[PDB]
Amino acid sequence: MSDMHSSASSQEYMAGMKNMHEKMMAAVNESNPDKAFAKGMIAHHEGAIAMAETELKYGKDPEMRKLAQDIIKAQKGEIEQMNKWLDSHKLEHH
Amino acid sequence: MHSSASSQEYMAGMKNMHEKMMAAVNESNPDKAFAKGMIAHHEGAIAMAETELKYGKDPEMRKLAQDIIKAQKGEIEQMNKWLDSHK
After folding, report:
1. Helix (H) or strand (E) holding A30
2. Which residues cross the membrane (chain A) (predicted)?
3. Touching check for A82 and chain B: CB below 8 Å?
4. What is the maximal distance between C-alpha atoms in chain B?
5. Of the candidates B6, B15, B26, which has its C-beta nearest A10's C-beta?
6. Is the Cβ of A84 closer than 8 Å to some Cβ of chain B?
7. Burial A17-55 (b: 16+ CB within 10 A, else e)
């Protein structure tokens, strides 16, 4: 399915998308709703960054290229926030 | 197929989203593929964030969900305006 594509850009947009979506779908089956959100949203953010990276490789529109840049920066930072929350949310408050 | 009411709601719509996004990115124009694919992906994030506001009990993740909804909605508006101009 990822092997049927109109163009190099579409091949790259599709590459990894199924695995990312399967990762999202499985991750949100975590029963703790906040942990499901963090794990699902990290997976979503991974997919957003990948799509934005492909737009920077192949895009030829200045507005969409700039938006792709901005999405990458913001999504990376939110992944960092979510990972820190996942690592630290069970720590004892002293 | 799911552990909980919250997980059932998180999963709802995600399948049709993968198919929708695979189709969207098969536009030959790479910037249009990006805009259509990313609108769909933003819609997925908004749906997940809404479910986190409905079921979540952690203040930090609830605040992040609220911020994501606002930002993604704004970027959807930008991408739609760009699509209309491109047409």
Report:
1. none
2. none
3. yes
4. 44
5. B26
6. no
7. beebbebbbebbbbebbbbbbbbbbbbbbbbbbbbbebb
